[PDB]
Structure 1
Amino acid sequence: AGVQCTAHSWGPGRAVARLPRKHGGIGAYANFARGGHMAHPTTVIRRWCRKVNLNQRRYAVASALAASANAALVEARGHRIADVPSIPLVVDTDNVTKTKDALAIIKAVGVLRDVERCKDSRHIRAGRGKMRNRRYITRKGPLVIYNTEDVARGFRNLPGVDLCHVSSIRLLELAPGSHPGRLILWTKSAFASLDDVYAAKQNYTLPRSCITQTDIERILQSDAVQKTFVPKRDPLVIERKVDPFSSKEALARLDPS
């Protein structure tokens, strides 16, 4: 691109800038010239894919799974979970092959307001994305995890729903837009098999548990920590400058006599 033409600098004495010019005298072969090359042409040698350590990929998938268990983190991510009876939500499904039957489970389990928020959020995107095979955006909502159940067909056409096997959970799904807290509907096979999947990681040991702010705040107000505290000396008194001779009280405060 931009280099397919034959252009040479006209020279140094023709009252023209020294940029390369075509036979007619037309600017060519430069970033500032119309039809010229990019100064630094973009190239496929860019590293498109980064690298992550398996222990670090598996830390995130586990931490995202844990974030799903919090019904405050789940509500912060946007998902509507008020009707949901309990988080984590496990549902004894069988083989659900009908969207009509899946909706009845989504309603009874209590995620309907969330699967409706997504349905009623389809819209044409802002930008040239609309022209680039990215025209419609729908809010993400529930994610069904399945093991040994045919729940794919019924829950797939439902909108804003995503489906994952317990054998290959996907971080991008667990934390949509780098936000942990996805409302996940779990089949009773998947939730029972989650401890088997973690065991099958050959030598993985789950990140050891750590405490939260609430535990630290409780410790700082604990009998031992509070008792050790010493009360500091009383603060210094400052007071803005006053000329003593202006006020007898100011003089009295400086020299009482």
Structure 2
Amino acid sequence: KRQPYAVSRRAGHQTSAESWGTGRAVSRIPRVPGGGTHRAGQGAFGNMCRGGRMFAPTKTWRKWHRRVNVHLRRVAVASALAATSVPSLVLARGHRIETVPELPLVISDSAESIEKTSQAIKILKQVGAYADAEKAKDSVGIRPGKGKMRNRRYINRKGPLIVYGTEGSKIVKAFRNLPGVDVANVERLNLLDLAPGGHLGRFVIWTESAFKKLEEVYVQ
């Protein structure tokens, strides 16, 4: 999910540098021809020059694609479902939950056709699953570093994930803009949804029709 990026591939390459050689108490590095300027790094086929290139520092090669094995991936996806049926991992990941009488949540199929966010928070409140989304509508971190100057002003904590089991890939529109939320269908579930940061046991909300489709993902 990462672009390739790099240092310039023609960089400080096209800089004229020719050496004095020796007969000078000046290091045997190439040197600018132009003496008649108030500065500029003194010749620049170096790794050792102000404003010159460096032989390494990136340049388009670096694979930002690592191949995944589907059988390997299948095990990881399957494991992620199981992490919601053990409460210990949910607690460990740092979900605040006052939640229901039973272990993973199964919900009625009628929360697909929910337009409003106002309705969406209300239904979650009844469950007690609104709790961690309330902890992500505040305590939202202005992230340090250069990320502020990109577009990454706020990194929002990860609360409820809702997974629908409507066949035609139907995004519940209301649930998309809730603080700390993610939205998924069964037809697009991935490891990173159920385990941001690689830490399995995110609190997830399963639709009834979603529940029996989770089988067909692709000692003990």
The alpha-carbon deviation at position 34 of structure 1 amounts to 0.4
Distance 1:44 1:66 in 2: 41
SS of match in other structure, 1:21? coil
Q: Does 1:179 align with 2:199?
A: yes
Distance 1:114 1:100 in 2: 16
The structure that is helix-richer by fraction is: 1
Q: Does 1:27 align with 2:42?
A: yes
Q: Percent identity?
A: 54
Distance 1:66 1:124 in 2: 33
Q: Does 1:148 align with 2:166?
A: yes
Distance 2:107 2:129 in 1: 12
Q: Which structure has more RCO (C-alpha within 8 Å, separation ≥ 6)? A: 2
CA root-mean-square deviation: 1.8
Corresponding letter in the other structure for 2:58? T
Distance 1:159 1:85 in 2: 25
Residue number in structure 1 paired with 2:25: 15
Q: Is the 8 A contact 1:141 1:183 kept in 2?
A: yes
Distance 2:171 2:205 in 1: 11
SS of match in other structure, 1:164? strand
Residue number in structure 2 paired with 1:126: 144
SS of match in other structure, 1:90? strand
Alignment of 1:8-87 (within 5 A): 8-24=18-34, 26-29=41-44, 30-87=46-103
Any stretches of 5+ residues in structure 2 without a counterpart? 1-10, 36-40
SS of match in other structure, 2:148? coil
SS of match in other structure, 1:58? helix
Distance 1:28 1:133 in 2: 38
Relative to the length of structure 2, the TM-score reads 0.84
Q: What per-residue deviation string (whole Å, max 9, x for no partner) do you get for residues 82-138 of structure 1?
A: 233322111104111210111111101111111101111223111111112211111
Q: Is the 8 A contact 1:91 1:109 kept in 2?
A: no
SS of match in other structure, 1:130? helix
The alpha-carbon deviation at position 24 of structure 1 amounts to 3.6
Q: Is the 8 A contact 2:114 2:172 kept in 1?
A: yes
Greater Rg over alpha carbons, structure: 1
Cα 1:151/1:6, change in 2 over 3 Å: closer
Residue number in structure 2 paired with 1:106: 124
Corresponding letter in the other structure for 1:83? T
The alpha-carbon deviation at position 162 of structure 1 amounts to 0.5
Distance 1:132 1:38 in 2: 26
Distance 2:61 2:114 in 1: 46
Relative to the length of structure 1, the TM-score reads 0.73
Q: What per-residue deviation string (whole Å, max 9, x for no partner) do you get for residues 218-249 of structure 1?
A: xxxxxxxxxxxxxxxxxxxxxxxxxxxxxxxx
Distance 1:28 1:64 in 2: 57
Q: Does 1:89 align with 2:109?
A: no
SS of match in other structure, 1:185? strand
Distance 1:28 1:79 in 2: 58
